[PDB]
Each structure stands twice: as C-alpha cells, then as structure tokens.
C-alpha cells in the first residue's frame, strides 16, 4: 500500500540553543546531518517532543522546520510535528511545513484541557482540511494523559489522509489489536527501549530521540528481529537499554546533546526551564561513551 | 519615580475571566469588556484572574494574551484587584507577558506549574525564580495537578515560600489534609482555592479567598458561602453550596466554558464562541440549561 | 427498638502475641479505653484498623465476642464482616447479629475486577442471609474501587442498606451523596479531615486515632456543628500533628504504643506488620508530652 | 525438576454454595495436561478463585490437583495470603504433598513497606524450606516491584524466580539481564510472544486451559526465530482472550471446558455465572478456533 511510504527509522531531531533560548542554527544543521550520515537513519521527525518544541514560539518552530530540510537530501524522509494547543498556529505551521515539501504532518493529541474525543478528532480533521497533507496521529498518553481506543482509531483511520500513528502507549495488547485491525495503516513506535518488542509486533518503523546517538544498533535490532534473529536483536536491546536507562537518569535531552558535543558538534544548551547537563554526571557518562563507542 | 503605588491586599473572591471568540478564534473585545464588567458589577467580585485556564489562555498566541490583559484592565475601576496568569511552556513568552502585565499595573502574577515534560522540581523552582527576577512582581504558584500531572510537597512548598516574592498559592489539589498542613505551616502566605464546588470546605480550612470560572454566574452565592461559613452560619453556607454544586455539576456535564458563556449570552452579553478545538455549546443541552437558569435565577 | 447509629466510633485496634494470636485481655482493655477514657459512642469492630484482613474466621469471632463483652448495653456496636469469601462474610454477619451488634458493614469486594452488579449482590446476599442492617464501607485508597452517584442510588434503594462509611478523599462526591440521601447515615472515616466532613453534614465518624484522640475529635465535631469554626479547625491542626506523626511511624503499631503508655497490654501487631521501631521512641515520647496522650 | 515451561493457572469448578466440585476439578486438571499438553499446573492462583476460598478449600484444591496428574508433571502451589499463619500452614501442607515450588502474591490491601513484604517471603521460606516464586501482580494489588527491590529479594537462594505480570517490557528486559540465572514466568496471556522474545523461561495462564496448544506454538516458534508465524498465532489467541475477557473470564473459560463434556460447574459468588446472552457469540468463537 501507499500508506507505507513513510516506513523506516527516524531521528526525533534534537535542537541546540544559546543562553537566551534561541535556536543555534549551525549546530542544528550538524545534528540533522549526524542523524543521516553518521547514524544512517531514513529520516527526521522535526519539532517533536525531543526538539523541545513545546517550549518554542512560532518563529522558532519555522526556523527548525526550515534548517532541518535545507540540511538533508531529497531522498531523506521528513515528518513535521505541528501539534499545538493553538490550532491557528498548528494550521499555520502545517501550511508552512507542507509548502516546504515535508512528506507528512503529525500532531500530538490536544492536552492540558480535558478535550472530548469529538474535539480531538476535529482538531486533526481541521489541520488536514486546511493543509491537504497526510497526517500521522501522535498518541503519547505518558505526557498528555490522553488514551485512544480501538473504536476511536477506526473513526480516525477512516479519514483517507490519516495515514497512521506514532504509537507510544506502553501496551502491546493494544498494539497487537491495532496492528491486526489496521494492516495497511502506518505504525511507527516511539519507545526506543522496547524497539525489539515493537518490531515483532509488526511496526513499520520507529521514531526516537536516542537514535541520534545509537541509530546504528537500532537498525540492527529492527532488521535482526524481522529476519528472525530474535536473540542477537535482543542482545542489542540490552546494550541499547544500558544507554537509554543511563541517559534518562541524567536528563535525556541535555545528555544526548552532550554525547553529540563529544563528536565535535556544537550542541549548545537546552532551553530553560530545562537545566543544562549536571557535571556531577560527567564521569559516569564518559564511562558510557567509551563502553558503547558513542 | 515618586508615585504612591498602593499595595492592595489580595484577599477575596475572583472570577477566572472567560473570553468570547469569533469564528476564527480571535478575541471579541466588546464581549470581553462586558464579561469583565459582569464579574465586577453584577457578580460583585473583588477581582479578576486574567489569562487563566478558564480564559482559554493556553489556546492563544502571545499577541492575543497581551490583548486580553489590556482589555480586562481598561474595563475595570482602580479598586478592582487584578492577577495576571502568565505561566507558559515558553519561558521567554512568560517573562514577556509578565513584564507586560506588570507594566499595565496588574497587582500580581501567577504561573501554572510547568507541564507536559517531566520537569524536575529544581526546574519548576527556577522557572518561577526566573519570572520573578525578570518582572520584579509578586508571584502566585498556580498548583493544578488535575490538568498538569504535577503535585507539590510540603518540603517543596517551604523552599518556594522562602522566596519573599512568592506571596502565595492558587490551590486545586482535591486534598484537605495537605491544605490543612500548608495552612498551618505558612500562616502569612496567601492561599486562594480553585475548586468552586468545595468553596465551603476551603473557607473553613482558612483560605484567604478563591478563584473560579463559575463565579462569573454564581458570584453572589459564592460570597454568601464565603461570608456565612466565616460568620459561623455553617448550615446556611452549606445549603448555598448544595445549590452551587447543582449549577456546577450541570455546567460541567455540558462543557463548562461554553455553557457559562451561554448563561451570560442570556443576560445580553456578547458571549461569542469558544476557541477551537473547543466545540460550541451543543443545542441539545438547551432545555436542561433553561431549566437551570430558571430554578437558580442566573 | 433499634438505636440511633449517629455518633463517634473507635475503629477498634487489636493486640497480638508473638504468633499473631489475639490477646483477649488487652483487647478488652483497648475496648474499654475507647468507651470510658475516650468517651466515644461506639466501637467499629473487625475493620481495617484491627488488622482484620490478616485474621482467620475463628479469630474474627474472638474479636467480635470480646468487644461486645467489654462494653455496656448503651454502647453502639458496628460489625465489619466484609470478606472476599462470601460464605465467611455470611457466617460472620449472622454470628455478629446473634451477638447483638446494631449493624453490619462490609468492604467493597476487592482484588478481582468485580462488576458493579456483582458488588451489589454481594451486599444484597449478606443482607438476605443475616437480616441485619448494612453499612456500605467504601475505601478507594485500599481497594481501588470507586462508587458513582448512580451506584449509591441502586444500593441505597434497599431499606436495609442504612448508610456508608465514607473514605474517598472527595468533598464534591460527599456533598452529592449528602444532598441525595438525607435519609441515609453518612459516617466519615478520614480522621485528618473530620472538620471538613462535619461541615459537610456527616452523621458521625469512625477512626483509628480516636482510640487515643477521641476527646479532641468530639470537640472538633461539636464545635463545628455549632458554627464555632475557628476553634474546631485549630483542634484539627492539633489532631493532624498527631495523625501525621502516627502515620509516619506505622499507624497501628504506634497507636497501640500510645495506648501502651497508659498501662494497656497492647502487645504486637500481627505479621507481616512489623512492630514499632525503637528509633521512633524519642519523637513519639515528645508527641505524648505535647498533646498529653 | 527444572521449573521451565508452560502452566495452566488451574480453574476450579463450584456448586451453588461455592463448595469445590472434586470430580470436575480432577477433569479440569487432567484437561490441562493431557488435552492441552502443558508441562504443569499453577494451583490456587487468582484464576482458581483462590482468594474467595477458605483454608480447608485451598487444601482440598491442592490435594485433588496433585492426585489428578502424573509424577512427571510440574506443580507450583500459590500459598500467598494476607494471613501469614495461613500462608505458612498452606505452604507446609503443599510441600508435604510434593509441590515442586511455592509462590505467594505480594501482600496487598494495606500499605505494607517493602521491608514488610520482604520478610513475609523470607518467613514463608524459613518455615517451609521449599523454593519460592514471587507472584508480582500490580493490576490486581497496586504493588509494583522496583529493580533494586528485586535484587534484595533474589539475593535469597530459595527465591528461585518470579511470575511477572507488570505490563512493562522495559522493566522485564532489565530484570532478564540483571538475573540471567533466575526463573521468569510471564502471566499475561495476550503478550506471550513479546514475553518469549524478551527471554522468559515459560509462562503461566488461565487461557492456556483452553488454548494451551497455540500457546506452545507461540513459545516454540518465537524462540526458533519463526517470528511471523508466532505473531499470527498471537493474533488468533488474542481474539480468544479478548472475547473471553468481554464475557467474564473465569466463567467463560469454564463454559468452553463444559462444551468438552467436563463438569465445569459455576464460579464462586460474588462472581456471577456465564450470561446466556453471550452464548451465540461464544459458540461462534468455539466453531472458529476449534476450542
């Protein structure tokens, strides 16, 4: 099917900032490039959670969208996250990413307020109507507190422009049901640490923050698992989970950015209120980098 | 320069200001002016909580939030207390809004707890400190676990409340044990409760006042509940709470922001629409609503 | 004629020997202290607070029988006979009724995800086999079970479901239930919020800390109903120092340690509850002196 | 015996008074082994309606199940209970019968400290001298076990493994690699294939009483790298599991067994019996998957 066009493995693009929380355009270019050339991924997921997107103004997000695309070739896959509590902004950001040639939009489920399902649905439908691009639903119950049922996915997936879902719920019974119920829809998993379990559950790819530094083992996990080399794939998951668990204990986005500064990348700073990497973790992280050759 | 800038006590009852929008999500300025005046003149409230949850703030852009602050302010007398909710996931935005509200003469800022990301406590703390340091205004911690996922502990309240510019808290956790502790541990800080439907329990727990969306339509009952409970007329206070919770329950089952704005249309106010993705009031609730306005004189 | 069940009740605490057998002598002592020293209206026997879910059927009968023996005929007696084993619940309800207990009460079936109609008919069945009055015992904090407005209606429609021991931390739902069922007995079970429950129109309360703080609690309840609210709330501050302290040290062992300071043979908790930790003793002695316990 | 393998969480048939039906029980037990080709029985678990039973009933269930099956059959006795004296008495009784290991649910209802939970295990082990499997079930109890707590527990040589039911494959993978020499049995039937490629040594399940064969294929194929076929069988098994959950799991599984000529009797109240409004739908599932 054509709904599997955007299959494969994406870096959820991190963003470097200066002291005043402004995008460092030069390090951004480098991080994009690092994800394609060094990590060998199929594409970038731009302005997602990992890019500190929800801390940004509209101009900043356009800035990220623009530099990301300029920074890669025509054959690279590009998904633009335009979700926002401000639907006018979401539509604005959607038209903008679309006119730039991003292959698909996506949008986090509306959050903060307890939106009814019907409100959630027409939020997606409205971005679609006004942009005419393909749309990937970004189901993330850990950050939003919003869960979507099988019946609700049926209604959503009945829209010929809702091409699939970045799936985040820690539930493999639900993953399996969705997989069986929507076999020609696109499913990308967003739990780096359960990449192997997602892969055997038939996901079409994955989107991840840790693939910015560990994209190579991720592709082995994904290929070894589909080739039935379950054991070798799983061993790489152990390896990948030492890395993920370690990086989470130190604060994931600044820490990943730090692993990149070690490759000689201008990885700048997180945007406040996120704090910079705590040096009291320097030794422990050096030991991690050497161990896994990061 | 040498202007006698009077420091209002922030005690009392506030409307969390509702905002009316047009078909494209832009602010209806005359609608807003009427809504603010209804809060003061008809509902007899002490002040306005501006750009809060109830005002659909987290759906707006920076310019629109600036707009709301300006209109609400220009629409009330100088006796009226104003609190500016400037909290936002974009800290540059919050500082900007905070300087802007402060230059307009808003009596305090508050900011919701940073949400969405699992921010550490040291991150939440410094978010507040950074707003304070850039605005130099008094700050009220907006503590809302039901919308944010963020709870705050007693030891952490001590750390925040040790900043002389953190003057108090907008309290919404449905926990009357923690409220009591906080009340006793911080006797000279300001506590304003945010659960309309538990105003009576909050009042007897020693809160200094309250902020609510429903006060926009039930502000006179609220006052009665507040005053009677403190005057020891406990039974009459609670009976008025039975009535209030009738209203609150009904309005919650219909979509609270649109419905309250619809109760206000009915008084000739230009109540417009909510901002999408909120849907407009569903006409199927109409008759049930008319029954409620009639039984309760809204 | 039936008694008026309104009032203040101790959730009765139970002393154990080194083997988790009941210490009958100390039990009588704890019961007597609740009525004579703490001036409470009744006992609620075999509730969470008496470590009842740790007990076998014979032990629960022991406690029923000792409690009743310990007190005068004017003393209100409510029997918690709820149990995952419905046959057991029925056997204890009948046993407690034949003893003269004024009402039965029963926890919401828990552990399994029982459907509401299952929860309903557990109550209706206990009632039908015992023919005593029943009090729904709702504790979301321990069971993870919530009961909706509509669900209380179904239950309360039954003439022999006479009320509810309420412990959900939700004063909106308390108020709803209060408005809708003015004919039903509401007893609250959160000591640290007795003032809030009192201004919300509860007909009394059941608590474990009233075994040591029953006098302040009566005052909180009386003062607040009489609208002397500033003073009730101040006694809640005081009561909450006690509750918070007791909570942080292991509430049931600590409560029985306090009772122990009064000459009561309050023995041990039943394993796997661990006994009071000596490292807490100085801080505990400081509580006893401050509030004269 | 090696404790590896696939177990039926043994269902119990009752009469109208919630008394055990011993003949039906012998039959359900033999069905798991002879018809379902399972390695063992997990006796008096949640699926057995254990927590609705009295002490003597629990003993009756242990006795019937053991006398029902051959010596080569693996047997685990769930003895956990809030009454530690009852757990110790049942663990002694099940050990004297020859049960290969004990397990005990995490103590629940009350907010026990971890230290209290630890010593509940250690005391049971001390008095029984049998091996012990921690039955950790956050869905039913509200208790999660952290990785550092596992280590304190698994440091005991007699705590041989864990029946793991937390729906968290991050935590499972951490435990799998922190305790390569411990036994891990997964208890979520609907995620058997994810558990298998995560290194579980086998699994315990109520639905295996009717779909034990497919489950064996899921286990075997997945370990063989036959990943697509294993996952397909999980789709099939998940149709069965979903349907069974929507109708009342214990009574419905017992209805499937009754269709096989087994005296599956009733659930113990307050569980209600199978609702006949589900019969057509249940008949169709049985026709479709040859149950």
């Amino acid at each position: 099917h054509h709904n599997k066009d955007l299959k494969g493995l994406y870096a959820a693009l991190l963003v470097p900032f200066d002291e005043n929380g402004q995008v460092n355009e030069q390090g951004l270019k480098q991080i994009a490039q690092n994800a394609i050339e060094t990590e060998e991924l199929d594409g970038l997921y731009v302005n997602g959670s990992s890019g500190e997107n929800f801390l940004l103004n509209t101009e900043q997000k356009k800035q990220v969208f623009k530099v990301a695309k300029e920074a890669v070739g025509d054959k690279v896959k590009l998904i633009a996250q335009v979700g926002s509590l401000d639907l006018n902004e979401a539509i604005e950001l959607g038209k903008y990413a679309t006119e730039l040639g991003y292959d698909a939009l996506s949008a986090v489920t509306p959050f903060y307020y307890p939106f009814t399902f019907e409100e959630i649905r027409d939020y997606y439908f409205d971005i679609i109507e006004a942009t005419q691009n393909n749309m990937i639903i970004y189901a993330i119950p850990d950050l939003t507190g919003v869960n979507i049922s099988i019946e609700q996915f049926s209604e959503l997936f009945n829209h010929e422009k809702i091409v699939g879902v970045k799936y985040t719920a820690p539930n493999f019974f639900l993953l399996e049901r969705i997989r069986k119920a929507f076999p020609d829809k696109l499913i990308l998993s967003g739990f780096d640490e359960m990449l192997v379990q997602a892969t055997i559950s038939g996901v079409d790819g994955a989107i991840g923050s840790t693939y910015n530094v560990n994209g190579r083992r991720a592709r082995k996990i994904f290929d070894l698992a589909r080739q039935g080399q379950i054991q070798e794939a799983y061993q790489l998951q152990h390896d990948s989970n030492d890395i993920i668990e370690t990086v989470l204990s130190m604060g994931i986005y600044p820490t990943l950015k730090e692993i990149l500064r070690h490759r000689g990348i201008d990885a700048g700073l997180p945007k406040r209120p996120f704090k910079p990497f705590n040096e009291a973790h320097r030794q422990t992280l050096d030991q991690l980098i050497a161990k896994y050759d990061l």
Side-chain angles (χ1 to χ4, degrees), chain A residues 1 3-18 20-74 76-98 100-149 151-159 161-165 167-229 231 233-260 262-294:
Chain A
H1 198 247
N3 292 352
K4 262 73 185 272
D5 266 29
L6 299 196
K7 66 182 183 180
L9 297 170
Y10 296 68
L13 184 65
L14 303 162
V15 178
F17 298 90
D18 74 1
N20 300 314
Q22 294 313 303
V23 180
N24 171 350
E25 295 205 337
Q26 301 74 45
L28 183 58
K29 193 188 206 217
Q30 279 179 335
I31 297 180
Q33 286 192 340
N34 169 259
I36 304 316
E37 299 158 43
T38 312
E39 295 302 329
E40 287 159 349
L41 297 163
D42 305 289
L44 312 181
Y45 188 72
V46 179
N47 275 329
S49 292
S50 297
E52 323 189 29
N53 174 259
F54 301 94
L55 280 46
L56 307 178
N57 66 48
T58 307
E59 296 40 63
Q60 292 188 300
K61 304 167 178 190
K62 289 175 165 181
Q63 214 181 345
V64 168
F65 278 147
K66 190 170 89 92
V67 172
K69 154 96 183 207
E70 296 190 319
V72 302
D74 278 347
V76 162
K77 280 164 182 193
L78 295 167
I79 303 170
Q81 202 291 130
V82 308
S84 167
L85 295 181
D86 187 343
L87 174 71
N88 290 328
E89 205 201 352
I91 291 163
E92 178 186 351
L93 291 178
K95 290 186 188 279
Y96 181 78
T98 296
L100 276 189
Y102 274 80
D103 296 289
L105 303 197
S106 83
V108 292
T109 276
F111 52 91
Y112 191 80
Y113 297 104
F115 289 109
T116 68
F117 175 68
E118 130 183 53
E119 293 168 327
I120 301 160
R121 183 197 67 215
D122 295 346
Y123 156 93
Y124 287 113
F125 284 24
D126 291 346
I127 294 157
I128 296 156
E129 174 175 335
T131 63
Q132 293 309 308
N133 204 328
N134 296 321
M135 164 74 67
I136 295 168
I137 301 145
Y138 180 172
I140 190 161
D142 325 281
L143 308 192
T144 67
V146 194
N147 311 285
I148 306 140
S149 64
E151 291 73 10
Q152 293 178 340
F153 278 111
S154 267
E155 172 151 18
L156 292 161
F157 285 147
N158 183 58
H159 198 304
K161 291 227 160 81
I162 299 192
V163 129
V165 55
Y167 182 93
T168 256
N171 182 348
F172 287 95
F173 182 20
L174 189 77
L175 186 42
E176 176 275 323
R177 293 335 254 168
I178 284 161
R179 195 6 122 203
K180 167 182 182 280
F182 308 112
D184 297 309
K185 291 289 158 160
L186 179 92
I187 307 179
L188 271 28
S189 71
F191 35 68
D192 300 15
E193 65 260 34
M194 311 175 281
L195 180 60
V196 68
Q197 295 81 181
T199 296
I200 74 89
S201 316
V203 300
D204 304 296
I207 294 163
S209 64
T210 66
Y211 315 154
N212 286 275
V213 308
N214 194 54
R216 221 94 56 39
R217 293 191 188 83
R219 177 175 309 291
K220 288 188 170 75
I221 286 160
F222 186 80
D223 293 332
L224 290 180
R226 310 207 290 161
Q227 267 145 38
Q229 303 302 124
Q231 279 92 20
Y234 188 38
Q235 209 64 19
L236 287 163
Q237 194 71 66
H238 295 316
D239 290 0
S240 295
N241 285 11
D242 287 340
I243 288 156
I244 300 153
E245 166 182 73
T246 293
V247 119
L248 288 171
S249 72
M250 297 170 189
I252 193 164
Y253 315 138
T255 304
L256 294 159
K257 266 139 160 203
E258 286 311 301
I259 291 169
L260 295 180
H262 149 101
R263 298 177 182 188
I265 281 175
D266 189 6
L269 297 170
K271 198 163 185 300
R272 288 173 275 116
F274 282 120
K275 267 165 153 40
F277 180 74
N278 197 109
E279 287 304 321
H281 291 123
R282 189 56 71 170
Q283 280 86 27
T284 309
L285 167 82
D286 274 315
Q287 285 150 20
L288 179 78
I289 296 159
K291 181 164 177 172
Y292 289 102
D293 190 29
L294 299 175

